[PDB]
Amino acid sequence: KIPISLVLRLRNSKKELNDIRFEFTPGRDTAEGVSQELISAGLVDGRDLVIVAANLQKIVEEPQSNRSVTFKLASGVEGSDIPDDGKLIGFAQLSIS
Amino acid sequence: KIPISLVLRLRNSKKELNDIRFEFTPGRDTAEGVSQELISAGLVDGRDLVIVAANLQKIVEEPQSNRSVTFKLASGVEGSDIPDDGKLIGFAQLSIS
Ligand SMILES: [Ca+2]
Ligand SMILES: [Mg+2]
Ligand SMILES: [Mg+2]
Ligand code: NA
Ligand code: NA
């Protein structure tokens, strides 16, 4: 169908926050496939494969209704940073562009 | 039991953002009942009961993992306004406090 324009906001190894812009085409892409692409590109931690896919699936099922989600990262449980959803420390935000 | 503490962010007719704070106790409260409380208080449009309750239910199922959601309102927009998810015009934001 028509590609969905997405923004994944999360912090890298330098703890810098970045807007990762990518697209998802229903019927062509899969949530877990796109999540792996992001990991292979070094943009997402591999430990977050399942969680990022799960939340990507939530947004693409009904994108006119569900515009953004903020969710805990598995990789953040294993870091020393104190988790803080409001500043995306140990959490990520996935939104329609 | 320790209630879940939540905040619903809505923009009023003067284009002002308001944060509505409320609580949800699992095993006691229901998503529909707490949503109707917000409506009875005059804080949420009755037209939005179903969508707000549905999103409340989703966030209280795993509140440690799912921290915020931005979703379309059924009460819609009026005047010269067009829906705008970034500005929460015709959309609402529900978060763990
Ligand atoms: Ca927008
Ligand atoms: Mg693609
Ligand atoms: Mg009361
Ligand atoms: Na917090
Ligand atoms: Na206007």
UniProtKB/Swiss-Prot annotation, chains A, B:
SS bonds (residue pairs): none
Tissue: Ubiquitously expressed in all tissue examined.
Post-translational modification: Autophosphorylated; promoting its activity.
UniProt subcellular location: Cytoplasm
Function, in words: Effector serine/threonine-protein kinase component of the WNK-SPAK/OSR1 kinase cascade, which is involved in various processes, such as ion transport, response to hypertonic stress and blood pressure. Specifically recognizes and binds proteins with a RFXV motif. Acts downstream of WNK kinases (WNK1, WNK2, WNK3 or WNK4): following activation by WNK kinases, catalyzes phosphorylation of ion cotransporters, such as SLC12A1/NKCC2, SLC12A2/NKCC1, SLC12A3/NCC, SLC12A5/KCC2 or SLC12A6/KCC3, regulating their activity.
Family of this protein: Belongs to the protein kinase superfamily. STE Ser/Thr protein kinase family. STE20 subfamily.
Protein name, as recorded: Serine/threonine-protein kinase OSR1
Originating species: Homo sapiens (Human)
Underlying gene: OXSR1
